[PDB]
Symmetry: C3
């Protein structure tokens, strides 16, 4: 049985636009918990993490809200490690992607051998020294990679951090807006990725075949899927802060997750960057939330071909 | 030469929403006959079947309008068998999909060896005992399969029925909203299908290769294509009663049909579920009808690469 | 380094709808030059060609504006041949596609061995004798093919013309609206093409593999890409005179060009048929121009996976 641990993380200081901290809210009221139970899922809601208000959090060089970001992630890492010890797949309904730092960190504590699939239009691997915006939702990966420790300076709020994954344990899918420094890091550290160009070339089918074989070839190991809503095309998930045209299809989104589900190795899930305040219409918000909800259910079993219980219909 | 027999079937009691019985009307006024003739097609319009008004048709258990549905289908089966004996491909411009029962039945009478391709977002294989809605447009296949006779009760209006096809003579394409009982029947009877997951995985090209090889491997045999308009994505065919996101692409729709046409074995065609009254705008109606018209022309020869006569241009 | 030569060609008499002669304008103000320089490109703007006003230009049979069309193309051929001798890839920001005649002609002068990739929803290979509209933006290819000289009559304004490419040096991609005579010419001259049916069947990946292998198999040779904006789906490039549904995807558009760029053999580029006056909304115009701009940048290096300089980030 698929046992899940719901972690609400209403946080937004990893990026400038407010409203992403409403994510857990709109997703829950969308009926996410009820829908998960509607399936053969065991679900325990750990609630919305109450995030510390850090008033004195001036920039560190160019990095914005470092103490708020580092604290919220440190708080999440603890809860995630908690649900994992409870033998449940952690489902972090987030705000911005900077939370990936705490999410993946807490996961690795209980499962140091985890492999990561990062669905996103961006690589979010900028360092405090390479970021040009200073927004931490575009730097989470830089704090988690071991190869990169020595290049990430001491940023207030992240002293608790310890790179938990190496360049060979992560695969990107959906890339279409990568900075030059990020690209240099990709090729330099030899990180495996499938940008939109590879998806167009090979097909999402082969893309998934190759990604799983890549991460699970040597052996089976826990999988952490970090799903940034902007990885999908804006025609599907318009209410998000950093949209980029030419994204992953609604179908491709479901394919990716249906395939992950079928491995039986999913142990961590992040559904990030849904910002209801950024929809141009009420339907744009509804369209984003519904899509985010559908991708979530696919991670936990919902199959387009249908499902049925071990009973004689 | 492609000889066609147009059968207008303005029927809607297979489902709750009225307006689908206008289908033949909007399609004809869209210039369907003229366009078919514009090609190298021989076309005979058998007119719109005048459908009996059955006032006393109370539910059978949960099944709605059983006598109206069974009568309209029995009426269609007779006409279809008529055009087939006239050596013409039957083209049933319908209302709801429950008409598939009469359409496929009348077809098999003249060609008992027929194979069926069912393009739809749904499997429409619920039985009177498994249906939760009672709407017969989601049960046509259950009445036609031989393996299932023994599970389909005696429903008023369908005593004339006799399962004409077995589980190994039908292939589904486009599935994305299948009930648990329907899924159980799929896996239990070993029915061949390509849900959206398979289309995403293999590509519509391989999907078609496999479907035709599946049905025509052993030998060439007449093909009956039952095309439910909701099999295509709602961005293409929005004016339909049961839309489901993540559907077949406009291009994929044309690919499927262009491939069927090229076999030279098409003998029966159903273009169902177009409901002009369900469009949110006049353009949504026009968009649905135009797409339905385009898929029809592709079944009878229109090729995207172009066409030309056996003359020196 | 990718050295480019910008040629503005504000011309519209190859088709009935005015406004396409604004193309160079909207593209330049869209920041095209600046964006190209933003990359590792050397860019020289040869300006907007001042096109002769030919008042006395009555139809030739059915052919409209023959002297205006032939003159503007003759003028472009000279400039294109100029930038090519300057060792720069010619980038013709055009109006209508009839300019392809002058563009490809001037290119071949300096590089007679050139191969052509024609991205378009149409084959634009009608002859003055096969065209039913008389609009020259649908006849450019007929004037350029050697095999066809003997069938193209003496049309006022094109005496300067000399077919420069044979049927075996051109590949079409995106076809979905081809006339019967054009189709007859396709099959008769054995021209290589990938209509939307082939793109759906094989995938844009294989399509590109096959196209380049086809044209560059025997040997490496300069490539001329003639990109008609209507080759892409109208949901991407709506502001164009002859749109056709079921077109090339935004992603496929970028894939095609990213692949061409990677050959290192691009020498001529046409970005045609963008008509800002045909957008139903200001955003439809912006959407068309932005897409046309993105396809242009991809031809010159912009990669979705990212880019970086030969420096240590
Ligand atoms: Ni992103
Ligand atoms: Ni992200
Ligand atoms: Ni359906
Ligand atoms: Ni149906
Ligand atoms: Ni065109
Ligand atoms: Ni063209």
């Amino acid at each position: 049985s698929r046992t899940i641990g719901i972690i609400g993380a209403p946080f937004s200081k990893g990026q400038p636009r407010g409203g992403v901290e409403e994510g857990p809210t709109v997703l829950r009221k969308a009926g996410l918990l009820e829908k998960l139970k509607e399936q053969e899922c065991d679900v325990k809601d750990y609630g919305d993490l109450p995030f510390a208000d850090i008033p004195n959090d001036s920039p560190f060089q160019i990095v914005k809200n470092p103490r708020s970001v580092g604290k919220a992630s440190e708080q999440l890492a603890g809860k995630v490690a908690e649900v994992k010890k409870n033998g449940r797949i952690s489902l972090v309904l987030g705000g911005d992607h900077s939370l990936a730092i705490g999410s993946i960190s807490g996961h690795a504590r209980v499962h140091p051998d985890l492999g990561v699939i990062w669905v996103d239009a961006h690589t979010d691997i900028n360092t405090p020294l390479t970021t040009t915006s200073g927004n931490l939702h575009g730097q989470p990966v830089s704090f988690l990679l071991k190869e990169l420790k020595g290049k990430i300076p001491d940023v207030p709020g992240f002293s608790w951090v310890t790179p938990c994954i190496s360049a060979k344990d992560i695969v990107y899918i959906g890339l279409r807006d990568v900075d030059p420094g990020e690209h240099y890091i990709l090729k330099t550290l030899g990180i495996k990725y499938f940008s939109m160009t590879e998806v167009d070339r090979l097909g999402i089918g082969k893309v998934m075949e190759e990604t799983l074989s890549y991460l699970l070839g040597r052996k089976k190991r826990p999988i952490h899927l970090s799903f940034d809503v902007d990885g999908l095309d804006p025609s599907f998930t318009p209410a998000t802060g950093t949209p980029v045209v030419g994204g992953l299809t609604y179908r491709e989104g479901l394919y990716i997750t249906e395939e992950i589900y079928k491995t039986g190795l999913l142990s961590g899930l992040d559904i990030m960057e849904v910002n209801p305040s950024l929809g141009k219409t009420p339907e744009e918000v509804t369209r984003t939330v519904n899509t985010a909800v559908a991708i979530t259910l696919a991670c936990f079993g919902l199959a387009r071909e249908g499902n049925h219980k071990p009973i004689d219909y």
